[PDB]
Subunit: 143 residues, 4 copies
């Protein structure tokens, strides 16, 4: 497996970025990469709560579902959750942890995903996150 | 002005795909709300005479704005017309927007006209909003 | 089928948008669409004055030179200039600006576009350029 | 001083990306962040060669000149140059090294900038680079 990490400085308070990661309405807009829509099936934001949604390629209809559970939640500071692909051919336990800290300009965002299957090329995960992070910024930075 | 807005864009996507983006609740929730806003679809009956309702929420403040109406006409990959009115009493006025699509070698031609914008809503504000929504629409409909 | 029309509302005062259309440092940054760079050869911004630029596809390096002359220059209100490619028709584009509470109203009309170049491709090119224009002029 | 580090995966070959860091017509387009234009004064792309340019805020016209020397240049793989802004209280210079590696999707880019005066908040540098990098991608990824 492989571990990946990203870092972004955002012009928004950490609490607002934090909410963006848990709010189903926010997630459906910023999480899916370009050309993908997202349907959120379950969003129980509690330690132990279940995560559930699926991405759909808009031009083909190709759907990919995934989900997991929230392992830890520290308001405006930390989110760690598991990810399990319901796709036929990707078993295992992928864990991502989001760390947020305040800055004068807003917030420092750290993301790390461990246990990424060797089948999934790391480069693809970075491309995917880069698109989603750009979308997250457009949503959280205003006002 | 007055109370009217007209938008034209060339999209690198088939007319049918763009058409689909204007009626699919999952697409709409992603591209329709402008920057800093999220969308929640309350009702979505995609057929002539059918009603629909949605609400926009400013993500930073939580401030909500709900609007709704009925579809007047639906021709696959060609046109869509619907009534659009706000629940806010401070924004009285029924809006009529008509979307027209046509094929092109690169993809599709899109024209949008919004009539009846409430007097309390500066038309320039609608242009700023649609310009953001249109950019998001392109990002969704143009790939692959 | 040789005339194109674009309209945009910008969050910047008219005077600043006007300057973006004439400042060579601004033009080199926003005019060339995605994947293109621009070199400004001439920029005599006076009525009767000439401007000359070249767009280069960054990946391939294919060059495209074009130029013309300014016919109208009213600070924050109007710019009109001719435009011709160094490849064998003359075009005239007119930019009109008006103040708005939120900033500026921008109208563009480009006439005489050679039938050789599909209008749809001009719209696509302008859409990319206008997005780049907004990013430069709306700040601060 | 402080050190900044950034990482991006780009859908373009390393040589084209490399080229974007040395071509004056490219730098003038992607290097200056939002609301800024770039004027290139001198651009001698070779070891020991001089580097000189200035960013101008388009709205105010406020100028910011900076320059340096190219210390290392390896086609499609590495670039190392010094950088210093023309400001009092800032006698020392910074060193930034760009490293590229191929990927099937295109290229992996790593940037490291050290020697940033403690007076300059690192977060501001990140925001600046994030904007420059998005412009870089739009330029180099096409075709």
């Amino acid at each position: 497996p492989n571990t990946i990490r990203l870092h972004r400085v955002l012009s928004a308070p950490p609490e607002r970025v934090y909410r963006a990661f848990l709010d189903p309405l926010a997630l459906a807009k910023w999480l899916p990469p370009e050309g993908f829509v997202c349907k959120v099936l379950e969003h129980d934001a509690r330690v132990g709560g279940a995560y559930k949604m699926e991405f759909l390629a808009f031009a083909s209809g190709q759907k990919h579902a995934f989900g997991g559970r929230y392992l830890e939640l520290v308001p405006g500071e930390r989110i760690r959750y598991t990810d399990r692909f319901d796709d036929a051919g990707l078993p295992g336990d992928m864990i991502t942890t989001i760390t947020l800290a305040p800055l004068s300009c807003g917030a420092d965002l750290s993301i790390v995903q461990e246990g990424i299957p060797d089948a999934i090329p790391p480069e693809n995960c970075y491309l995917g996150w880069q698109q989603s992070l750009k979308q997250l910024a457009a949503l959280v930075e205003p006002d």
